[PDB]
Symmetry: C6
Subunit: 53 residues, 6 copies
């Protein structure tokens, strides 16, 4: 498991704990934030996704 960075279309930068995934129930992009909380965002709002080094 490796951390990722998501750049959103509204100019935010989100660091994820592990690789984000399409949620099986909602079709949204599911991720765990740096505080361990599970969040979901719309794929259409994600501009770029890359593994953090």
């Amino acid at each position: 498991s490796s951390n990722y960075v998501m750049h959103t279309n509204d100019g935010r930068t989100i660091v994820t704990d592990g690789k984000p995934q399409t949620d099986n129930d909602t079709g949204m992009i599911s991720y765990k934030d740096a505080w361990g909380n599970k969040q979901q965002i719309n794929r259409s709002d994600v501009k770029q996704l890359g593994e953090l080094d």
Copy 2:
């Protein structure tokens, strides 16, 4: 567990249980606080999270 949905038009919706893609319509189906089944378009949902 209850969830909070934030829409692109600025609404905050609390769901009873986790929302899911409706098998018939492809919309996001959820149960409101009163037990009624509602559907909204995924493209109108900005954020979705478990409520504390």
Copy 3:
């Protein structure tokens, strides 16, 4: 079978006879109106859909 109320993005309110469903051939949302007429609309034009009590 139960009736539904559909709100479109152009501000219309449509009552359906039975639950709307994705048409297998076109991928559009198929429904029967209050007058028994079968229509299809695009999912992207549907804002809300809810069961009538």
Copy 4:
């Protein structure tokens, strides 16, 4: 087999010979026009689809 009418978002009205279908190769909406010619349009450009009576 029955004829259909498509209303596009640019204000056109297209009568089809038979029911339009998602093309298996392209994912576009495939239809046969009133002159017997096979055409394809994008589903996103279709506002409403209904069988002609």
Copy 5:
């Protein structure tokens, strides 16, 4: 058979054979007049028809 593709930005593209959804990218894949494989987004295609 050759096809004609009209895009939303006003381009007219002639393809060698019928275009198809690319299995890897989900884009519309086609072969140009010179035999080169190209891909465009379906959302940019307005019309697609067999060329006479």
Copy 6:
């Protein structure tokens, strides 16, 4: 394996090492850049994609 040129809607030109592909977990377009870095972008941001000769 062959290199590709990707044109984005924001006017960028990206050369990829190998063919880009839809990521199985996120549904985004995964690619390796000229510097060997793995990135993911949204399909809706890709205007054109073509094989380099």
